Amino acid sequence: PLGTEGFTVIDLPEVAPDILPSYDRCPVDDYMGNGTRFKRFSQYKLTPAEDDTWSFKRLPHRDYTTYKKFNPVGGGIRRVYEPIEVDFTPLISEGIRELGLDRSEPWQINVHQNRTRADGGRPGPLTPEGVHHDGHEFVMIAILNKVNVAGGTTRLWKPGADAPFWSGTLEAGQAVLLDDRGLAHDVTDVLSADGGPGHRDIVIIAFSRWAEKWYGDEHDAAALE
């Protein structure tokens, strides 16, 4: 599992050939990134399955809801997104393996398929909410492709720190796994590398025990206050 200071960076395996092209078919995110962001969203139930296997079950598609206390810019509202088309679960399995997720109860995950674009005039903001916790137990952020972009540096922060204790620009084929409770994080804006268009394609997976799931009417009611 995570290495003493509550995060690990891993290399990801090769991904199925449909995954990278699917980012072209993600519709604009109407709620975050002011036109720079494109998004699909699905939710899964994670159950331990026999000899060290985890099974994934796609849940009925629902609006995304989070708390303003975790995301003041995009929280407290129903965010209507389309489902993810492709299958990120083999990639996610790598994070489950590196986290060594507690097999003693089932888990629930949010899966964000995010493209952020940058251009000469206009960086692509990755965490306009700033330094923050997502509100879950664990978070996995995986980079699937970067084209003509600089910046996009992940920074990890201890509670109350004036400066991050760790920084690193995650590249295509890398993922960071983090204790989303013990650590906060932000990420610097995506910058156009040469003045022309560029983009950064990622997946964010937020892990919560099913008993604390971010799914259903009770969660929605709480997140929307």
Do 201 and 145 contact (CB within 8 A), yes or no? yes
Q: Could you tell me the maximum CA-CA distance found in the chain, to the nearest angstrom? A: 52
Instruction: Give a three-class secondary structure readout of 60-91.
Output: CCCCECCCCCCCCCCCCCCECCCCCCCCCHHH
CB of 33 to Mg ion, least distance (A): 5
Question: Of the two residues 48 and 182, which places its CB atom closer to Mg ion in the complex?
Answer: 182
CB of 3 to a second copy, least distance (A): 30
How distant is the alpha carbon of residue 158 from its chain centre?
A: 19
Total count of residues recorded for the chain: 225
75-104 positions binding a second copy, by CB under 8 A: 77-78, 80
Do 150 and 193 contact (CB within 8 A), yes or no? yes
Q: Which of residues 83, 130, 195, 216 is near a second copy by CB under 8 A? A: 130
Quick one: what does residue 59 bind among a second copy, Mg ion, none, with the CB cut-off 5 to 8 Å set by partner type? none
- Residue bearing tokens 């590398």: 193
Question: Of the two residues 8 and 65, which places its CB atom closer to Mg ion in the complex?
Answer: 65
Closest to 12 in 3D by CA, of 92, 126, 116: 92
Q: What is the DSSP letter of 100?
A: T
Per CB under 8 A, does 126 bind a second copy? no
Per CB under 8 A, does 159 bind a second copy? no
Please indicate if the annotation marks 67 as binding a ligand: no
Question: Of the two residues 132 and 219, which places its CB atom closer to a second copy in the complex?
Answer: 132
Quick one: what does residue 123 bind among Mg ion, a second copy, none, with the CB cut-off 5 to 8 Å set by partner type? a second copy
CB of 111 to a second copy, least distance (A): 21
Quick one: what does residue 198 bind among a second copy, Mg ion, none, with the CB cut-off 5 to 8 Å set by partner type? none
> Mask 31-60, x = binds a second copy (CB under 8 A)?
xxxxx-------------------------
Q: What is the DSSP letter of 5?
A: S
CB of 65 to a second copy, least distance (A): 12
How distant is the alpha carbon of residue 172 from its chain centre?
A: 14
Q: What is the DSSP letter of 120?
A: T
Question: Of the two residues 48 and 209, which places its CB atom closer to Mg ion in the complex?
Answer: 209
Q: DSSP letter string over 20-53?
A: HHHGGGPPB-SSSSTTSEEEEEEEEEEEEETTTE
Please indicate if the annotation marks 134 as binding a ligand: yes
Q: What is the contact surface with a second copy in residues (CB under 8 A)? A: 30-35, 72-73, 77-78, 80, 121-123, 125, 128, 130
